Design the sequence.
């Protein structure tokens, strides 16, 4: 089965340079691990606003993770995670941008959990949401509870940390 996976990465001011760099590295690693498969990728940076760094069509055209994230500039503003999730649900998974109608829609959200906005993400209900916690404050399962609201259910199976990203194991099959 085909899969359209979007990386939604936190680019807020709370991210230290080394941490933001770790996020970019993680995205590159995930893409190289799923190269030449039925997976197609898109990447969206979010802080106060939302920016599609590359879409599905760009991936098909260029393929190279290094060249795809080359123009990325750390936003360094707020953390509007809910607005970001909504932006992806309506502005990214579009046929005009290379999205396949039949493909399973997957979202890999990379953030430290703290959102500066609120609201509902019903427009993203049909998207499978995996949440990858950044930083050294998600060492325990209890601390990961703060990420539950953004993930698909059961939350315990769609939430993990940047270091190991064990919750993504099924994607690599
Ligand atoms: Mn932040």
Sequence:
């Amino acid at each position: 089965g085909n899969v359209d996976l979007v990386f939604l990465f936190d680019g807020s001011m709370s991210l230290q340079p080394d941490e933001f760099q770790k996020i970019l590295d993680f995205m590159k690693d995930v893409m190289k691990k799923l190269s030449n498969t039925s997976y197609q990728f898109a990447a969206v940076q979010f802080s106060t606003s939302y920016k599609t760094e590359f879409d599905f069509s760009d991936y098909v055209k260029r393929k190279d993770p290094d060249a795809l994230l080359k123009h990325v500039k750390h936003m360094l503003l707020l953390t509007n995670t809910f607005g970001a999730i909504n932006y992806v649900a309506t502005e990214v998974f579009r046929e005009e941008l290379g999205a396949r109608p039949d493909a399973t829609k997957v979202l890999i959200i990379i953030t430290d959990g703290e959102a500066t906005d609120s609201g509902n993400i019903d427009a993203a209900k049909d998207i499978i949401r995996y949440i990858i916690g950044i930083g050294k404050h998600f060492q325990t399962k209890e601390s990961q509870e703060t990420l539950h609201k953004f993930a698909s259910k059961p939350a315990s199976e769609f939430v993990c940390i940047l270091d190991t990203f064990e919750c993504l194991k099924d994607l690599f099959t």
Observations:
- The chain is about 25% helix and 20% strand.
- The pocket of manganese (II) ion is lined by residues 12, 14, 79, 114 (CB under 6 Å).
